[PDB]
Write a protein that binds this ligand. Sequence first.
Ligand code: CLA
Ligand code: CLA
Ligand code: CLA
Ligand code: CLA
Ligand SMILES: [Cu+2]
Lengths: 73, 31, 154, 99, 93, 146, 42, 743
Amino acid sequence: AWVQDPLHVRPIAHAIWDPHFGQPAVEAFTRGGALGPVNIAYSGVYQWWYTIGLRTNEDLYTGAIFLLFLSFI
Amino acid sequence: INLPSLFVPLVGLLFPAVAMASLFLHVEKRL
Amino acid sequence: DIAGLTPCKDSKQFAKREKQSIKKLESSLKLYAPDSAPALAINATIEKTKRRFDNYGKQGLLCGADGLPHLIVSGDQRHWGEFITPGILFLYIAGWIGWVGRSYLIAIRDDKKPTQKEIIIDVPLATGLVFRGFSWPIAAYRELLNGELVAKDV
Amino acid sequence: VEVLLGASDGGLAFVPSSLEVSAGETIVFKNNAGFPHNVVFDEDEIPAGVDASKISMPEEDLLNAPGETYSVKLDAKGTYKFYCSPHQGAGMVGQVTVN
Amino acid sequence: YGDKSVYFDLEDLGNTTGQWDLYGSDAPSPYNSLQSKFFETFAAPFTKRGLLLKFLILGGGSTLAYFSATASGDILPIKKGPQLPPQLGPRLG
Amino acid sequence: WVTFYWHWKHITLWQGNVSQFNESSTYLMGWLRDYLWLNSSQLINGYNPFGMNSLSVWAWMFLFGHLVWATGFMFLISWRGYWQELIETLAWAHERTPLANLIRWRDKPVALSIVQARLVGLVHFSVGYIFTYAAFLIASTSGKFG
Amino acid sequence: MRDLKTYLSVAPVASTLWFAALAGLLIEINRFFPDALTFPFF
Amino acid sequence: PEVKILVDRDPIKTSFEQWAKPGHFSRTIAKGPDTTTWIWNLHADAHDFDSHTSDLEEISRKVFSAHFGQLSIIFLWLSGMYFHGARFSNYEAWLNDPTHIRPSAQVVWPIVGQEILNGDVGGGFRGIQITSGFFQIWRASGITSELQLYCTAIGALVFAALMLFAGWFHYHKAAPKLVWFQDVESMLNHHLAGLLGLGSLSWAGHQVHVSLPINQFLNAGVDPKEIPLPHEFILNRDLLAQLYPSFAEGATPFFTLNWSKYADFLTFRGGLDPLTGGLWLTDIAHHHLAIAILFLIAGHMYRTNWGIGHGIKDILEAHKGPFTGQGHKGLYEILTTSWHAQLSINLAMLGSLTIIVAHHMYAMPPYPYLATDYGTQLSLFTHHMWIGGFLIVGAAAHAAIFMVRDYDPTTRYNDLLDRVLRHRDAIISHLNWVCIFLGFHSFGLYIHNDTMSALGRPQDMFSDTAIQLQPVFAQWIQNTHALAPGTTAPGATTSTSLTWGGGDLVSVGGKVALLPIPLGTADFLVHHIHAFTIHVTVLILLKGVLFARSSRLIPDKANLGFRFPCDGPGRGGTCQVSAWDHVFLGLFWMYNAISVVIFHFSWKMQSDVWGSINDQGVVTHITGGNFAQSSITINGWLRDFLWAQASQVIQSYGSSLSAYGLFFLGAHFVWAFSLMFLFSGRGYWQELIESIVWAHNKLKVAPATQPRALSIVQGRAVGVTHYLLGGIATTWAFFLARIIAVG
Ligand code: CLA
Ligand code: CLA
Ligand code: CLA
Ligand code: CLA
Ligand SMILES: [Cu+2]
């Protein structure tokens, strides 16, 4: 979703799963068009990965698998 | 079936319990 | 002009500041007797404020976008009054102080109980020594050339 | 018309910050959240009705407690800009005309 | 030891160092034999150190895993999910 | 100092209000009021008696960093001797009480070392520092988003 | 008298009198030439 | 056996010999100084008389005359206050209209533009608004002109001169000896009956003839200059008979025992004056009369010279039981040979008294036009709280000094002291547990509330609407007090305060003097926070006192003296193992406790009592009851109290309250500065001064008094004093700027 309109959508870092959360907190943290509470990324990895060529989720999946391979080696 | 529903308790509750019990057991007695 | 600043006398924000400042004091003067002690004191400071703004304008200070007189220290000769001539004056006074102190320390270093003359000042010796600071620059120059300003052996 | 000083998110702004009311129409500046909010007019520009105290709230003294209302009335043809001296640096400034 | 004024004797260091047990009963089992024979027969398989520890850890672990992977919405709002439309950010959203 | 300077200059540039910095940055009351006290309203309003919003997690962390920092002062001000004697009387208390002297420690409790305590206090201080400033920075830029 | 002269030259009293004189001098100077951001004579 | 005046003639001749010699008392100091450390020692042990010598007689003579010097300083301060009120004040203008003019008795000279501090305090006057509450005292005493203030200032000046002279006299010409000091029976007989009994009887005499009629005239609305002078009220009696008819019989009621005929001006009303917002003066006069009678009888308990009375030794050694062995036997010998024991007892009692004074003065305002002067009220409460706390910490300091220096079981043995020394470990362990439990269940509740509120779960919070923790005991007690007048104090009409209840709000000039103070869950939480902080500082101080001589850590701690750095980094590290170091912490925790107390007071008052009344009786408070809902979480304190209240001081610049803003920032600075001394050690600094000394020596400008870094103890002392100065001063600036701007 972010690659389609980089200026008008907030990037998501990861989902939140916290059984200590209340209902208004669940409603307050669901941003970025997600289906639940999420965190908004400020690392800037979205812009970095977008600049270097990654476009789809399959690209990121191949990347993560390759890096798991690299760290195992 | 929701994967967080399983891994966040196990890694947040079970894993530290097991690891800390084991590490206490290892650190606090003589060989 | 220098650094894009403009001569305060011809700036508009500098004037606006002056008029605004003067405005508030005038309000403080009101609600009291027209010729009362407090009112007279407020008048005095109003005239003082007008004199300060005119003095700033006259001295040719540089004003930015806020109208505050900025100071140039690059060495431009149109601005030595801002930093460099006061700097020379300071260096003179500070050398005076330090040289008099050093002179005193050297003079009292030869007694058996030199700490006695440090917790309790010999004021006659001090008053004999204070005025050598007047010529401290020449004395220090000739002491450096002599090689006696810096202790050898250390 | 009622203007809430301060936002529920703690944002330092007016609600609505910019608007237009009718003639002789009283505008109420209410405090919503984030109080010591003080509404002080620009005193600059604003063609006619150049009194300061008539619409301004004097510096130092400001709205007290969670919900406070300093009632002003304008009634001057022209546009005026009402801001908050402590917060006008965070953008808590507003413009209100009566055409 | 305790001969009027002395309190130190090499032969009985424990008495000298106060190695007493100030509250132990030294009495017989107050529980009736029949009752004792009911418990130590049913609670026996839980008295092995490694066995009890491993079983406790893994049983409680799968207990938590099951009870949280299959909790209903009325227990945890985190799994009920949001119920409202979302707002927009200051400019984004 | 470096990051305060950077953040304030940029947070006034992003609002098109650079004169606000240009004028209030030359005195320290300007730094306190126009930067710290001013840009901290949304953050501390992350949660209030009237509800919470998405900034709450920062409003919490902001206070977290204040707590950690503060406890770092303990290990930096109070010194070992005090704590060692307190610990020894605690040991007496534990050994002397019924139903709990049945349990025995295996290492004699000692107060932290001198160097160890300086290290712990420094760690607390720096962690509190980093956390509260990160909370404030991300909440004050994220709140205005500009 | 001799001892009073001595005590009046002990370090704290010598320094308070010196700094009071210096303060008086600076106060009067700025009372005659107030609001001076530069050296305007030459 | 019998008691008499016993003196010594010219023990020390007044002379300027020792002024020329720095540290004459210390043999090592007298010789002279080798390093910079000698200068610091000279000051640190100037007033430690019990170490300059060992003679009790000399110590006590020095103590007596030092007390005289202190009294002289206090008198000079009082005369300065009165003179400034006479000459540089707007006291008469304030006297004409109290609730519009702001009191101010200090102006500044227009030197560097600082005249902006001469703000508009009203009354054709420009000065610095004072918070001393002196105007209220002067009005309650009946002072109507500035001639009376001038006369008072000059009288106090000559009293300061008299005190200084007496100090010189009783040390250099006629100095008492030991048996004169060691008489405490007659001393107590005179301080109870003579100083407090006659003092309060004399003050009641003043109020009956001066303050009562003059304040009656002032409250009737008379112009202050049209009021008869006080001495007229003594010369012409029908002047008083007009205001108070039963001044006509004139002291025959006092001897017929028809005391009811005095019911006019000797009342038992209670409550506040609805006109002035202070206590009824006819109540204060009666109060001081009864106080005088009580003290005059009480100063007749101890036997001095005529058989009748009580021997303190007998009373003490009569008290002992089966739990305490021979308790109280031997205390009379301890409390008459060591000044530190007496000093610590008196310091504890005086601190307790000061804090009780703060509470009672906030609750039952005694002066007219004081209650509605919010700045004065806040400042008085805060100041007395701080003074009380400092005194209470000094009590512990000197108890420890006694234990280290003067305690001796070989010659002066007491049983109770010995028993407490013998189970100090049980004492400290239980106090430790109480501190931990109290800290978990008071501050833990705040942390729980903060996370419950941040997780969007307010129902689970410990609040007035989710989970109530109601202080049922305090509510019950204050409801018992509200019902007291008429039920169980039949002679009273109003309850003793208005914070108890009964409605009956009292206002003055559109501002609220007092109203019933409600106690909810937030009050419960903050009261337990108070209990926690007090218990922890008590733990620190008591642990310092009980373990001052020896411990299981270092077995001979007394030989190292009361104050010392350490005994090396042995046994794991013995940093600050001394009694003096325990006092250093207690000051930190005393600061914490008193800070929380004054914050609680200020917020609660600005939220539920103070504020402005209006025409219907609608009370708008300074903050609309924001204390009951926002004070239950720490975010509420940081946002609604500090951040909100802090805005006043930040905006002070550019006005007459600018000095408060300046002091705010300066106090922040000096507080942060203390941390340099509190976090570092003197080794680094000695090693740095080494190379600085090298730099000086390279240019023949090195000093002869060798510069040393401060001692380890001195560095801690500099660090704690700067810390306290910074914190207290920033709170002072914040409070004053806020309450003067919003008040
Ligand atoms: C260092 C990388 C990293 C980090 C910081 C996280 C962080 C997180 N993961 Mg995650 N994860 C990772 C890698 C990582 N993951 C990888 C490589 C995979 C496989 C593709 C996963 C698969 C995964 C799943 C399926 C889930 C998470 C979830 C989560 C979140 C809940 C915490 C948790 O349950 O732990 C993580 C749980 C795991 C099963 C991770 C196991 C895989 C990694 C490689 C384990 C590494 C352990 C290793 C021995 C220790 C490394 C040393 C160092 C990290 C201290 C949390 C924010 C949960 C979530 O979505 O929260 C909403 C969730 O359900 N992760
Ligand atoms: C904000 C900083 C801070 C904090 C939190 C503390 C806390 C404490 N101090 Mg300390 N102190 C401080 C600053 C601080 N101090 C400073 C700057 C100084 C220098 C003057 C001192 C000097 C000092 C002395 C001299 C003494 C203490 C003592 C104590 C303890 C008092 C007993 C108690 O309250 O039990 C309760 C604990 C608390 C109230 C802390 C908060 C508890 C949290 C909220 C509970 C959360 C639990 C959580 C679930 C943990 C699980 C997390 C999980 C991930 C592991 C306490 C732990 C006294 C003591 O030792 O007590 C016997 C003691 O004598 N302090
Ligand atoms: C009715 C008799 C009387 C009175 C009024 C006082 C009053 C006082 N005594 Mg005192 N005393 C007395 C009898 C009395 N004493 C006796 C019989 C003994 C034992 C023999 C002592 C031994 C004693 C000691 C050891 C000390 C005091 C101290 C004090 C002062 C306490 C501080 C204070 O409260 O400030 C209140 C301030 C005032 C009340 C201002 C008024 C001051 C008046 C003028 C005092 C005049 C009373 C005095 C006894 C007059 C007799 C002396 C005469 C020959 C001139 C106080 C002024 C302390 C002190 O000396 O402080 C310096 C202290 O150290 N007293
Ligand atoms: C009636 C009250 C009283 C009295 C008579 C004494 C008397 C004494 N105390 Mg003591 N004490 C008291 C109260 C009192 N104390 C209180 C309330 C505390 C708690 C803080 C203490 C804590 C205390 C300690 C820790 C120690 C003493 C010590 C001593 C003895 C030597 C004091 C000395 O000469 O040091 C010299 C005095 C000074 C160096 C003054 C220091 C200046 C202060 C710190 C700055 C104050 C700042 C000022 C208020 C505002 C700033 C001004 C600036 C900006 C210009 C002495 C017998 C010392 C001792 O060894 O006993 C034998 C000791 O170490 N006291
Ligand atoms: Cu505002």
